[PDB]
Amino acid sequence: NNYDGDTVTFSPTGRLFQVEYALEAIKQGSVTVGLRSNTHAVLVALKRNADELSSYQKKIIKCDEHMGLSLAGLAPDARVLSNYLRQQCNYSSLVFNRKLAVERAGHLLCDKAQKNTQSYGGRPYGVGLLIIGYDKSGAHLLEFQPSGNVTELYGTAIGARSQGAKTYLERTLDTFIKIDGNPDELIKAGVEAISQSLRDESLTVDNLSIAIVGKDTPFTIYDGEAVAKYI
Amino acid sequence: TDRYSFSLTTFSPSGKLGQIDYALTAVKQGVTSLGIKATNGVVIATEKKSSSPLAMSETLSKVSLLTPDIGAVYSGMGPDYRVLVDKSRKVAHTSYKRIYGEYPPTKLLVSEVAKIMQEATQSGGVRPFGVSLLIAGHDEFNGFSLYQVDPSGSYFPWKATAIGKGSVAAKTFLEKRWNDELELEDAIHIALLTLKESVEGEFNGDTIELAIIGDENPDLLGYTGIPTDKGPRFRKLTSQEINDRLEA
Amino acid sequence: GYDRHITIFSPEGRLYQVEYAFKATNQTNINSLAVRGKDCTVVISQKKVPDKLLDPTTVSYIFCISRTIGMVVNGPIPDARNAALRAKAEAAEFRYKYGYDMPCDVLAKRMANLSQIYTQRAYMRPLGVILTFVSVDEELGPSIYKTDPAGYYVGYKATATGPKQQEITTNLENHFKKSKIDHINEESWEKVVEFAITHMIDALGTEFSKNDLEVGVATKDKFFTLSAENIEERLVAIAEQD
Amino acid sequence: TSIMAVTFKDGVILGADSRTTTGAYIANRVTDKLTRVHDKIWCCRSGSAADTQAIADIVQYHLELYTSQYGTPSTETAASVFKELCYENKDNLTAGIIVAGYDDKNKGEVYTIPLGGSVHKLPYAIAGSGSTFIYGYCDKNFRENMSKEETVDFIKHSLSQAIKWDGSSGGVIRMVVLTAAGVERLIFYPDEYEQL
Amino acid sequence: SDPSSINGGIVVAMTGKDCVAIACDLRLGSQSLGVSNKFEKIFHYGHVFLGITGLATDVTTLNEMFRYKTNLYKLKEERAIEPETFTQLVSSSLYERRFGPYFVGPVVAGINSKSGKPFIAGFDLIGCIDEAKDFIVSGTASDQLFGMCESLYEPNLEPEDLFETISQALLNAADRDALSGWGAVVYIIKKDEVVKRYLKMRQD
Amino acid sequence: GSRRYDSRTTIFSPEGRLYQVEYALESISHAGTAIGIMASDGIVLAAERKVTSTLLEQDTSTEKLYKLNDKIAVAVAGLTADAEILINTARIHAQNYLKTYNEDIPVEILVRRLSDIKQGYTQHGGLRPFGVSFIYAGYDDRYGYQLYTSNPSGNYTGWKAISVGANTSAAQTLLQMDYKDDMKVDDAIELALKTLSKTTDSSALTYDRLEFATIRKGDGEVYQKIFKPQEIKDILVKTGITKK
Amino acid sequence: GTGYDLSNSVFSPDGRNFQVEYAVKAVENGTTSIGIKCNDGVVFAVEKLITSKLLVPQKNVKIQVVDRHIGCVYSGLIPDGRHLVNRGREEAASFKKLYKTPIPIPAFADRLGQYVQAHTLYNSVRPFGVSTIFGGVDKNGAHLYMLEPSGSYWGYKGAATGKGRQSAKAELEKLVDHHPEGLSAREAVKQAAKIIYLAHEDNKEKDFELEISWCSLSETNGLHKFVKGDLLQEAIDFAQKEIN
Amino acid sequence: TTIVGVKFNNGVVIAADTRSTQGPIVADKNCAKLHRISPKIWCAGAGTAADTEAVTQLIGSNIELHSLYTSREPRVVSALQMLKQHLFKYQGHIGAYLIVAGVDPTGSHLFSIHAHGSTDVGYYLSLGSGSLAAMAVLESHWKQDLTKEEAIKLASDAIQAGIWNDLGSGSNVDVCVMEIGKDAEYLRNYLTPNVREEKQKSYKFPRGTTAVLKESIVNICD
Numbered sequence A: 001n002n003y004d005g006d007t008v009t010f011s012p013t014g015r016l017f018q019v020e021y022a023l024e025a026i027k028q029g030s031v032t033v034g035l036r037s038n039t040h041a042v043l044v045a046l047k048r049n050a051d052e053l054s055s056y057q058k059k060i061i062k063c064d065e066h067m068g069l070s071l072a073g074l075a076p077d078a079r080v081l082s083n084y085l086r087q088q089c090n091y092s093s094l095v096f097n098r099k100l101a102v103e104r105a106g107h108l109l110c111d112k113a114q115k116n117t118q119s120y121g122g123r124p125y126g127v128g129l130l131i132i133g134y135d136k137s138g139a140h141l142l143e144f145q146p147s148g149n150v151t152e153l154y155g156t157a158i159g160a161r162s163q164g165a166k167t168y169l170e171r172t173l174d175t176f177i178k179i180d181g182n183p184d185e186l187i188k189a190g191v192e193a194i195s196q197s198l199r200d201e202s203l204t205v206d207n208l209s210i211a212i213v214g215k216d217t218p219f220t221i222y223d224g225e226a227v228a229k230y231i
Numbered sequence B: 001t002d003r004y005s006f007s008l009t010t011f012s013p014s015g016k017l018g019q020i021d022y023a024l025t026a027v028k029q030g031v032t033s034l035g036i037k038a039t040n041g042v043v044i045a046t047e048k049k050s051s052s053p054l055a056m057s058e059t060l061s062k063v064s065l066l067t068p069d070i071g072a073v074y075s076g077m078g079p080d081y082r083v084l085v086d087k088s089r090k091v092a093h094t095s096y097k098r099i100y101g102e103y104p105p106t107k108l109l110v111s112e113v114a115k116i117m118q119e120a121t122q123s124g125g126v127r128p129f130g131v132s133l134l135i136a137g138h139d140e141f142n143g144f145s146l147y148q149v150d151p152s153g154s155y156f157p158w159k160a161t162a163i164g165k166g167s168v169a170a171k172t173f174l175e176k177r178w179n180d181e182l183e184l185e186d187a188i189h190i191a192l193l194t195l196k197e198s199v200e201g202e203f204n205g206d207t208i209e210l211a212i213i214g215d216e217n218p219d220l221l222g223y224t225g226i227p228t229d230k231g232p233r234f235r236k237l238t239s240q241e242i243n244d245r246l247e248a
Numbered sequence C: 001g002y003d004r005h006i007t008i009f010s011p012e013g014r015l016y017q018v019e020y021a022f023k024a025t026n027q028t029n030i031n032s033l034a035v036r037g038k039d040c041t042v043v044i045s046q047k048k049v050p051d052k053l054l055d056p057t058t059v060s061y062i063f064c065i066s067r068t069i070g071m072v073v074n075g076p077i078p079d080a081r082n083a084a085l086r087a088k089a090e091a092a093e094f095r096y097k098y099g100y101d102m103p104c105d106v107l108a109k110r111m112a113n114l115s116q117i118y119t120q121r122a123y124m125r126p127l128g129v130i131l132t133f134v135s136v137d138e139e140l141g142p143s144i145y146k147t148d149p150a151g152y153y154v155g156y157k158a159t160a161t162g163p164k165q166q167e168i169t170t171n172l173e174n175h176f177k178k179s180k181i182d183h184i185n186e187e188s189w190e191k192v193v194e195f196a197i198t199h200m201i202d203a204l205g206t207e208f209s210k211n212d213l214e215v216g217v218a219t220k221d222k223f224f225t226l227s228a229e230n231i232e233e234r235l236v237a238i239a240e241q242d
Numbered sequence D: 001t002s003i004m005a006v007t008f009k010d011g012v013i014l015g016a017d018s019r020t021t022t023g024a025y026i027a028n029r030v031t032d033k034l035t036r037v038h039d040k041i042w043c044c045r046s047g048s049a050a051d052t053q054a055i056a057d058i059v060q061y062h063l064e065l066y067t068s069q070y071g072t073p074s075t076e077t078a079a080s081v082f083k084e085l086c087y088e089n090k091d092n093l094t095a096g097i098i099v100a101g102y103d104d105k106n107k108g109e110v111y112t113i114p115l116g117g118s119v120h121k122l123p124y125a126i127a128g129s130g131s132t133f134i135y136g137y138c139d140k141n142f143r144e145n146m147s148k149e150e151t152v153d154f155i156k157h158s159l160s161q162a163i164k165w166d167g168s169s170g171g172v173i174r175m176v177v178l179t180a181a182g183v184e185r186l187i188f189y190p191d192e193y194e195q196l
Numbered sequence E: 001s002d003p004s005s006i007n008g009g010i011v012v013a014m015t016g017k018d019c020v021a022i023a024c025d026l027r028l029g030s031q032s033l034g035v036s037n038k039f040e041k042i043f044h045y046g047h048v049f050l051g052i053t054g055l056a057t058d059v060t061t062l063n064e065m066f067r068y069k070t071n072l073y074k075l076k077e078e079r080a081i082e083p084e085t086f087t088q089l090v091s092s093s094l095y096e097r098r099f100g101p102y103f104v105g106p107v108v109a110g111i112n113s114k115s116g117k118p119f120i121a122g123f124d125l126i127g128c129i130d131e132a133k134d135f136i137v138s139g140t141a142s143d144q145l146f147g148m149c150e151s152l153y154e155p156n157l158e159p160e161d162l163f164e165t166i167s168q169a170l171l172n173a174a175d176r177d178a179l180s181g182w183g184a185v186v187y188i189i190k191k192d193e194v195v196k197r198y199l200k201m202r203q204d
Numbered sequence F: 001g002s003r004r005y006d007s008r009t010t011i012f013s014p015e016g017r018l019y020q021v022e023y024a025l026e027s028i029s030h031a032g033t034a035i036g037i038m039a040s041d042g043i044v045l046a047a048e049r050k051v052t053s054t055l056l057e058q059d060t061s062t063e064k065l066y067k068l069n070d071k072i073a074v075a076v077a078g079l080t081a082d083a084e085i086l087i088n089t090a091r092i093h094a095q096n097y098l099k100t101y102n103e104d105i106p107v108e109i110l111v112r113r114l115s116d117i118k119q120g121y122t123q124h125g126g127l128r129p130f131g132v133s134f135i136y137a138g139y140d141d142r143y144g145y146q147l148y149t150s151n152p153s154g155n156y157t158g159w160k161a162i163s164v165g166a167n168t169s170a171a172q173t174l175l176q177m178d179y180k181d182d183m184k185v186d187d188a189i190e191l192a193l194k195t196l197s198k199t200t201d202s203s204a205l206t207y208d209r210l211e212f213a214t215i216r217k218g219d220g221e222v223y224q225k226i227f228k229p230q231e232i233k234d235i236l237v238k239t240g241i242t243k244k
Numbered sequence G: 001g002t003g004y005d006l007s008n009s010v011f012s013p014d015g016r017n018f019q020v021e022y023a024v025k026a027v028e029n030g031t032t033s034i035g036i037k038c039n040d041g042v043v044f045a046v047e048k049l050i051t052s053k054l055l056v057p058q059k060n061v062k063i064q065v066v067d068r069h070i071g072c073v074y075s076g077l078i079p080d081g082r083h084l085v086n087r088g089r090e091e092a093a094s095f096k097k098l099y100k101t102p103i104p105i106p107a108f109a110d111r112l113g114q115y116v117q118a119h120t121l122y123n124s125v126r127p128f129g130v131s132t133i134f135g136g137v138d139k140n141g142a143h144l145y146m147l148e149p150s151g152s153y154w155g156y157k158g159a160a161t162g163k164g165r166q167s168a169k170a171e172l173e174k175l176v177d178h179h180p181e182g183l184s185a186r187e188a189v190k191q192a193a194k195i196i197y198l199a200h201e202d203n204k205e206k207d208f209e210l211e212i213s214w215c216s217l218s219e220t221n222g223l224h225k226f227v228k229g230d231l232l233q234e235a236i237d238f239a240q241k242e243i244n
Numbered sequence H: 001t002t003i004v005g006v007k008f009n010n011g012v013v014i015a016a017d018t019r020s021t022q023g024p025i026v027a028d029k030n031c032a033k034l035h036r037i038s039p040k041i042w043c044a045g046a047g048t049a050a051d052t053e054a055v056t057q058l059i060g061s062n063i064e065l066h067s068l069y070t071s072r073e074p075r076v077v078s079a080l081q082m083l084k085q086h087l088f089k090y091q092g093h094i095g096a097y098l099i100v101a102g103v104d105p106t107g108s109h110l111f112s113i114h115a116h117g118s119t120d121v122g123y124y125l126s127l128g129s130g131s132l133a134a135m136a137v138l139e140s141h142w143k144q145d146l147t148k149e150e151a152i153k154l155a156s157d158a159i160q161a162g163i164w165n166d167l168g169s170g171s172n173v174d175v176c177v178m179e180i181g182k183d184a185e186y187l188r189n190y191l192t193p194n195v196r197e198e199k200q201k202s203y204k205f206p207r208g209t210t211a212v213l214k215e216s217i218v219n220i221c222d
């Protein structure tokens, strides 16, 4: 109320209301899910259009041949953060001949988002990110919130109505966690997961976007007719 | 990160500059000080009001030497006065001594200090100085002079004046006791009298601070061998001299 | 108005932030005093370690600024350590630039000028601390100089600071009025420490164990702080008196 | 210039000559090339008098600040400060410095820092234009854990030879003994060390 | 060739009985080629006169700068600057460009308006002050001027005699320098009167 | 952050006025009146001191009339210290023009530079404007004698006769009442002193409450004469305002 | 007046800085973290709330390392703690680069303290929303420190912060009173496991994962190491048995 | 140039010649090379005369400000440190070679500063082109426990040796004596051993010898 004028202000309870408003901006974004086994990691995003004459905005961004993410919320903030992640991967590769570990990428995104929440001027990022990757320690899925908190999970979902998909993942854990060496089955699991967050809508080739990375499979995005075989 | 780049002193709809008025209020609530211009010198005086008998009043000097021929006293906030004395001592060198090889005349040092205080009333993220200064000096081409500098940065030459709480009564007394033929000792005596009314407690050589801009004292120079180099015109009176003059 | 938030004048001509920093100086509920012997300077401060989980050796408000200068702070420990680090740096730089040890009063004036800067500039807040500097200056002898959030500083025959400061000040005033000298006429610093502890016990009306005090002694060419057992020995010597 | 520092059973001793030259002219014949940076951490300076004095003053400042913040520094720390200064300004400095210290834990250490800013911990170290002429001699006479008198004799003989052969060296022989007992200063005049 | 010898010229100042004198040549050239016969090298601010030998562009720049500074000095102090104070100002202004100085050799002359005492001084290009009691020389014929002055000068000369002396010094020094001459001016300065005379000299 | 304490000194009112400029003009409206009158053979400036005390040293006192160079002077109305800042910058600009062109600076160029400084203070920087109004009296070889006025807004205009500070309505009415285009400098002196004596908020127009200046011909040269207290007393007894 | 709690560096009339106290509230909302000093090292323990079973166990590590000998854990806003750890790593690198030796634990504590305190001097920055327990072994032995959002820090025999700080401090007081000789590193690891399990009662809603690290002169040779595998399982079993 | 400094039992003396040269030409026959850094701290300079004057003036101004700030008499070690660090900062391009002497609350001190920033301490010092002559006297006649007059004569004789045997030195001998208790006394032209003989003629020309083309009066009023 009187403590939401900027990010540099604590509330009497100890809250940062600008960060919470950014989280709200996320919760209004379109739904996207992430889930990984032990050999692959898959991103399934539901794209949102302006009207029937418009396109469905992209939600999955490639950061490196082994790492990518999906967005929910303010798309320009996702562009900024994914460009930073691209540079970090690029710096790792160029200076150390080393693919950037997904864990360190999450740490870097956390530290980048944090400094926007402690200094006057500016604002927290208005986007949430789901980062899939395959590195020296296998497949990885991260959830990033603009508060700075980044967590690794077997699966998750963000955006509007994401709780149905998230509880489905909580139920399907023992099943999808061992879909090793079969990418199409992991993508089927992801589509089944994102179906829980559908209210008065069904998946079409225009609004469905999938991404996959893993062992011997570079981070690749399937859009349009390519995803028709999962509908 | 200094984000106060805007002025903290702005014009009110009535035309007043509020922070300057409030600094003048702080000056008016300070201990009285005064200056008197004689024919062969100038006198500046004030009261040393110590907090505790354990405090050593002699360590803190309210009357400060600016140049060998220029001294200053104040009324208002002590720390502002101390930092102003430091800045003035340095500006007397950088902006004059190092350019002309001589110490600045009283008018110009007063103008430099006034520039500092004016900037304090207009620069970004600062408050005016909460002091008023009485600067007494002597230079070769203008003689003896006595100036008052206010928080706004304005300055005025005075034959005699006083600032602080007892400023009005002291000013009236000075008006009724000042002439243009007063010797230095006459001005010292009138200054002691004018101080005697504004001081409530003890009144002796240890409770009041008084200095003069009079003749050159070569004994205070520290070296001999240059006939053109005479002693400083500034001299602080000791407790002994003040008490000796208090007898009459 | 916002003349209560930043260091600008109130219509009464006051700086309320300076006054509230003065108020914050008492937050620790600790009293301290400083006195001068014949050839030394002693500071006593109350030591209160309430939490048993604390390492009592790290709970101190007396700082060694240099080989010769010691400083005891009345205020919260963050601003206290801020001032301590700044004073140590200032003393080191003074020595490097001018070729001799920074005097007690000069360091006091420097810290007071910085406090005045905080008093006049809006972006810097005052430090809620009172800094008592003590030493045996090679020109002035035993010295006590104290600074406050207002940028004020002055020297003292003796001094006291804290919630019960006035009582300690009156006690020392009465003693020096009776003695008619501006110092403790003792050749050993141990007896001056004993004097200080005795008069603080009197003024505060409380007894102290060896863990209720911090003691700092400054002699020619060294300032140091006493151990718990040295304080205990002083307390025993005091107890054996009449 | 002829300087050296030798570790022995009770601590460490630094030794130097007292000759400062401008060209072939002896600008000073009583120079004190033994400089203190901390109570029991000293240095022998060689090379540019200005450079060595500036470096020593800066190191003394840094060690005073280190003492005020964290207490007594190790000899290794003083050598590291000297090394940082000499290496980061190798293009504008010409200073060879022998840092010698004593603490109750390590019982005295010697670090040599030549041109370029490298640092080497040694039982003893020699440096200066005269040092060359005594290399062999020192390598034939130094032993570990000598006595105070043995170490003083070793340094006196080495510096006597260095002064004899090097025109840049000469004057008196200055020594600083750092032990648990403290700091002692020794001087030896030409009428004494020339007969050796 | 070098900046202090491209244009050439000489200035010389002398003191007498309650008077000073300052003279200069009129030549401005570019090495061998003589360019201008009217290049005077003595300016005045109030009652303080300043001659400047050396690089001509720096002479003009210094004249303009000192006019600037003396005007501001007069406005602030409400009086004319005195020869001693202007000497100090010249020295400080020169040293301000210590490692890239003006290639000049200034000379200050005047009568102190208060004491009435004659005053002269000279500077090198970085501002070292020589406050001579007898005479000051500067320019490409500095050695010739030095010899002429050390031979001819005697103290306490009356203005009509000091004029002849300084004129002979200047002329006979310029006639042994390929880069000096081409006319000359001489100022005789008394506390309340300044006369300026153009000398007739050989034009080669 | 610090935005909450920002007075925003360079913003527009809903009516299209600058708050701080209007308030600085309100401040100047309480300053001692200053009058300039331009004649065919000279210019006269006359300013009134405020609340002078008897112990005030009027010999070395200067609060109204300042020299910019030898051909341009200024009468100030408002904060003396802001005025002195602007005066020093104006003197520096005049000397810069002289050094660059070897000619004295024309009056309007200096006036416009100072006015542009003021305008800058009224459009960017977030600082308060100078509470000063200037009357410039100058002479150049293009427009001869010139009288200008400038205010905190950075606006400047030219005048045959003008007043700034307190009681400018009545003073301007009187000036317009008695001014003739052909009048000489002495008649302008009389008119200025009479206007001041009729508009002064004090009992009588005595010499110690006055600063006076004339830019005249005396040779082909212009002369700036800043009147000493005795000269002000003498011109006052000459005009008949005071008795000998 | 009112509104003092709206800017970061503003004193209240009672002398406090309410923004720091709101940060302290943010800290009190956090999970429980503790540190235990033993006779030759330190142990650090933290509760990690299992928000969902989708979280990968043993990942999402909270305890951070500084240099090779300092352990740091914090309660409150995890990103603020990470920022403080980044600064501390810079300070330690700078100290080592200049002085060769790794930074002593008190020196590192004062570095962190000066940083946090500086974050209470201006209204342009927000105080840290974490309380940080840290420490390790240096040339003078073992050191444990706790640092509050005000910049205040102290050395502790045992320290605890977060939602379960009360019961944790009670258990630590019991351990201190009963063991004047000091705990061993392994015994302190077991006691840290027990204290985390006990303090979980104040956050008993969700299930938790225990995370322990230690720096022991004998058990880890003066280096910071995470307690993994058999030792971690043994400490978990000790705590499970002792709470039942 | 020949500058020397000699300590004595209760203070310190410095001395210098008065010859200033532009290469081989004598620019100033009466140059004051003894500079006052503070009332009781003086310094003799050699090398670039402008550089010596400038650094001594600058360090003296800063020393005066420092003394007003600290409310203490200035110390010789302070001027020494400031001059040293300034000269070192400029890598010897400030060609000032100084002998700094003074009495302060800590006693009497005599130091030398090289243009590159190196400092030396001793009981007798000499710098300049004539130093080798002056030092030759010093090493011949210096002894411990010199009286005031003894040290004054020793410094004067060193400066005289420099004057006679060095082409870069000559004319008069300036001295500055600084005793522990007294003020510093600055003896300008303590010796004048190079008075010029009377010239064989007067070269006053008969009025009208010089040919004038035109004359005019120049106004200096304002």
Ligand SMILES: CCCNC(=O)[C@@H]1NC(=O)[C@@H](CC(N)=O)NC(=O)[C@@H](NC(=O)C(=O)[C@@H](C)CC)Cc2ccc(O)c(c2)-c2cccc3c2NC(=O)[C@@]3(O)[C@H]1O
Pocket: D001, D019, D020, D021, D022, D023, D027, D033, D045, D046, D047, D048, D049, D050, D052, D094, D168, H114, H116, H118
């Ligand atoms: C404790 C060490 C004692 N060292 C000496 O006594 C000896 N002398 C000095 O260091 C004093 C002499 C003095 N005070 O004038 N300084 C200079 O010479 C100074 N340099 C100069 O004056 C010049 O460049 C003139 C000629 C320009 C015309 C500073 C400089 C600059 C670069 C540089 O590489 C050196 C010294 C240097 C490096 C190594 C060895 C020697 C050096 N210089 C020696 O002569 C030397 O042989 C020294 O051993």
Ligand SMILES: CCCNC(=O)[C@@H]1NC(=O)[C@@H](CC(N)=O)NC(=O)[C@@H](NC(=O)C(=O)[C@@H](C)CC)Cc2ccc(O)c(c2)-c2cccc3c2NC(=O)[C@@]3(O)[C@H]1O
Pocket: E004, E123, E124, E125, E126, E128, E130, H001, H019, H020, H021, H022, H023, H027, H033, H045, H046, H047, H048, H049, H050, H052, H095
């Ligand atoms: C207390 C010390 C007293 N020293 C002297 O009197 C002696 N004289 C000066 O320093 C005065 C003399 C004066 N009045 O100009 N300055 C110059 O000579 C000036 N030189 C010039 O104008 C020119 O170069 C013309 C041709 C334009 C290019 C400045 C300069 C420039 C370079 C330079 O290397 C030096 C001095 C220098 C360095 C060290 C030693 C000496 C030097 N010059 C000596 O001759 C010297 O031997 C001095 O000892």
Ligand SMILES: [Mg+2]
Pocket: C109, C110, C113, C114
């Ligand atoms: Mg200061």
Ligand SMILES: [Mg+2]
Pocket: E174, E175, E176, E177, E178, E179, E180, E181, E182, E204
């Ligand atoms: Mg010719």
Ligand SMILES: [Mg+2]
Pocket: E203, E204
């Ligand atoms: Mg020809």
